């Protein structure tokens, strides 16, 4: 039964863990918003081979995932879970957390995302051959951007995306439930103090993140079956481990 003092301390711990592992500082992403790929540069990306675009994207996704793994390792209570459950949570949650974090690098004003040094719209990604998934990710990012998350809100929300007691295959479900609950208390306490509890009903339904992640796995299966050597030779092994069927 976590006291109010313990909950307040948890708020601080989670926010620290996130700040230390946020990958890019928000200030840097916001400054780069005026830096947008030219028509000619966009054409260059669209003319890239499917394999090279997939390779680049798998690399950048993996880099983001590595910071999320580091976030998990520093997150209060995560390393006290058993090895099986650490794995289960990260395998299911890593991509979900990256997708939420990604809204920081999304500009709702012109519908662009920070990629390889400049902002580009969904058209930058045409060579992947997954327009429906890409548009879905842009839609998701746009929905999150509307909420105007603070960094602390992203910290607390992403902690909850990760510590999900409903993930299939957990061995110590009750242990995860307790950690999840304390994190919910932390999130709710922080929101109440800042007059922000209104955002709770505007957060995306869990099925939304699950759908984006399943779609990712499905599209990778399509690419990998057609280009098995590329995946074996060039893709980060962690990306293969997490997402390959």
């Amino acid at each position: 039964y976590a006291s109010l003092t313990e909950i307040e301390h948890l708020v601080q711990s989670v926010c620290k863990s996130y700040r230390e592992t946020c990958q890019l500082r928000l200030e840097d992403l916001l400054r780069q918003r005026s830096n947008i790929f030219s028509r000619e540069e966009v054409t260059g990306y669209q003319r890239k081979s499917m394999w090279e675009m997939w390779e680049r994207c798998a690399h950048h996704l993996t880099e983001a995932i590595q910071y999320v793994v580091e976030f998990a390792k520093r997150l209060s209570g995560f390393m006290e879970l058993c090895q099986n459950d650490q794995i289960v949570l990260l395998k299911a949650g890593a991509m979900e957390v990256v997708l939420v974090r990604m809204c920081r690098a999304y500009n709702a004003d012109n519908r662009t995302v920070f990629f390889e040094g400049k902002y580009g719209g969904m058209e930058l990604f045409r060579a992947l051959g997954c327009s429906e998934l890409i548009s879905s990710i842009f839609d998701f990012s746009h929905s999150l951007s509307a909420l105007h998350f603070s960094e602390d809100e992203i910290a607390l929300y992403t902690a909850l995306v990760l510590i999900n007691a409903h993930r299939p295959g957990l061995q110590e479900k009750r242990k995860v439930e307790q950690l999840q609950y304390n994190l919910e208390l932390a999130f709710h306490h922080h929101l109440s103090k800042t007059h922000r509890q209104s955002i709770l009903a505007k957060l995306p339904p869990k099925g939304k993140l699950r759908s984006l992640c399943s779609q990712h796995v499905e599209r990778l299966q399509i690419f990998q079956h057609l280009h098995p050597i590329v995946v074996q030779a060039a893709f980060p092994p962690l990306y293969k481990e997490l997402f390959s069927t």
Partner: peptide, 9 residues
């Protein structure tokens, strides 16, 4: 696995 290695096991 690689996750296991990154987690420190």
């Amino acid at each position: 696995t690689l996750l296991q290695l990154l987690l420190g096991h």
